[PDB]
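Teaching note: in complex prediction, the entire set of molecules is handled at once rather than each chain in isolation. The prompt given to students was simply: 'Predict the structure of this complex.' The entities are:
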Amino acid sequence: THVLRFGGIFEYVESGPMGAEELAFRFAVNTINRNRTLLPNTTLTYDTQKINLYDSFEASKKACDQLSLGVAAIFGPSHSSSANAVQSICNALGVPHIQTRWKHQVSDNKDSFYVSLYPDFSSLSRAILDLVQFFKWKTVTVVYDDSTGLIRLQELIKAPSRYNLRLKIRQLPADTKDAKPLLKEMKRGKEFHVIFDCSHEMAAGILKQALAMGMMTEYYHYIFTTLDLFALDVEPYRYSGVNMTGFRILNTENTQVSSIIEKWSMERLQAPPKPDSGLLDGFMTTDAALMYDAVHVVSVAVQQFPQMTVSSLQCNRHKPWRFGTRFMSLIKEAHWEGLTGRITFNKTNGLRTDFDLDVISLKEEGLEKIGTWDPASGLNMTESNRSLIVTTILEEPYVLFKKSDKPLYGNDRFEGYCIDLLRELSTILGFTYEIRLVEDGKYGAQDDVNGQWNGMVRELIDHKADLAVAPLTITYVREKVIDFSKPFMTL
Amino acid sequence: INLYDSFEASKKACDQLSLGVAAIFGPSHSSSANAVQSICNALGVPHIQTRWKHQVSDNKDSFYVSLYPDFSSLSRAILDLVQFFKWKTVTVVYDDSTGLIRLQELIKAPSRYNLRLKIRQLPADTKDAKPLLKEMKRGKEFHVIFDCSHE
Ligand SMILES: O=C(O)[C@@H]1C[C@H]2C[C@@H](CN3CC(F)(F)C[C@H]3C(=O)O)CC[C@H]2CN1
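The expected output is the structure of the full assembly:
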């Protein structure tokens, strides 16, 4: 029947195997072909070209070859310089360029033949800040890997002048093994609240260093910028009590999406996994779920343009593709439920600025969902006969252990003036109670350096006790922090 | 060539390499300059740059030099000057993303030295800048670094 060809350009170092992106591309095409609801009468074909990383010259040549073979779109390469070069070519010949990865948008750049399936930085930036504010952090250390990290967090970096966040900015070194000296400074600095802006492979690496450093405990809370957080081996850390929170755009809760991610692991996990990585083997990363979603969203557009056919275009000549303008318009208007949730582009710039994120945190069970985020709602986090606990302290003759012939259990082990008072109060006011001897053997004073209380006063402040029944002197400093009865003895 | 047309920059660079040239004083702006640099690298003709663009570490091109004073050094000299004026408070105002990068040395200082610092962004047009300046005024931000073009 009817046939349409897509182009693919995938970046790599050394040689095979195939990478995640080129794999998801092929996988999406094979799947769609077999779907009888999507492109029923249409059968997708493709040319794939492999190039070196950062060789924009080679990327240009391969894109020109593909436009010569004839293609309806180029799922151009990932990295900034090659991607900008294929985008300029695609714009001159009016063939849609489909991107899956963020690159810096220059304002005065007029290219219009591209869409990008990657969740725009502006929106992610805001959702980081939204999360920080929900945890009520007033202090936070942002740690980034390379320059462009800065740009992904600009919304956050500019907050300290509107809201009340003091914030320290540090940079990782090239290698995470070099990161102890940096972590030691944060430790001395008491920087317990930390955002890591970096790849998920960097994050796996920096966590190991953080463990070594005594920094994976209940005292530390780490927010992760990476969307591939869910790919991290979390077995070394879930028992420790650290808090790890981040985001996930891969819609794993949907059953249809889980089954697709599985069939992927079978053809992929079948090939090289690593031991010392700290990543789960055969998890579908975001770079690849996006490519697979891009092939679908573009196909939804092809369904609405049966007239369209490929033309052999030459980079030599300034003659664009007849159907380009109309196809590009259909793609930008397209809507699709894919591996990464609602797909919808921005009328204005063709960037994916509106999308849905699950919000995930480390519980002892593993990484689990604790809410959602979307740009229009912010966070949607999904959150009398009692005995009184009486704190007291041994002090003659107020509270002592009773000497008795009879067996004594529980509260009846104690006697004294304060015990007699407690018994009367419990009868008059009608409560039951449990007597507990205070853990530090103190009445209650405030530390002159850190301002923390101890003794029975601290038990009350922290609501660990209901009552302190003891010869607790009523003083100015104490009455400011607890509520005393009127005195039962004056002296 | 047009600004930001890396495709046209590629074509013109190829024409020139065809005429024969000992070096291309390639174009100024990031995307066209990166494209002419990749071409120049494949054909081993020196590409001479005059403007800063972001250096990617894992990029292996070797046939270029850049006459623009590197950002790392300028960053330090800004910080050196701030410290000589003994400022402990400063508001950095930048125009566009890449401004951030030129001041990274300065932005990372508040954890080593004793500088509290506030980071604000200019709007597209400076005529729109009164509301921003009013906040700085109320804020008593008397010490200010402007990272932006001379225009
Ligand atoms: O609330 C308090 O801090 C005190 C503790 C406790 C203090 C004792 C008296 N002090 C115990 C002491 F021996 F340590 C010295 C003596 C005193 O200062 O005269 C009497 C019963 C108590 C009255 N309230």
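Point out the following to students. DSSP finds 14 helices and 21 strands in chain A. The radius of gyration of chain A is 32 Å.
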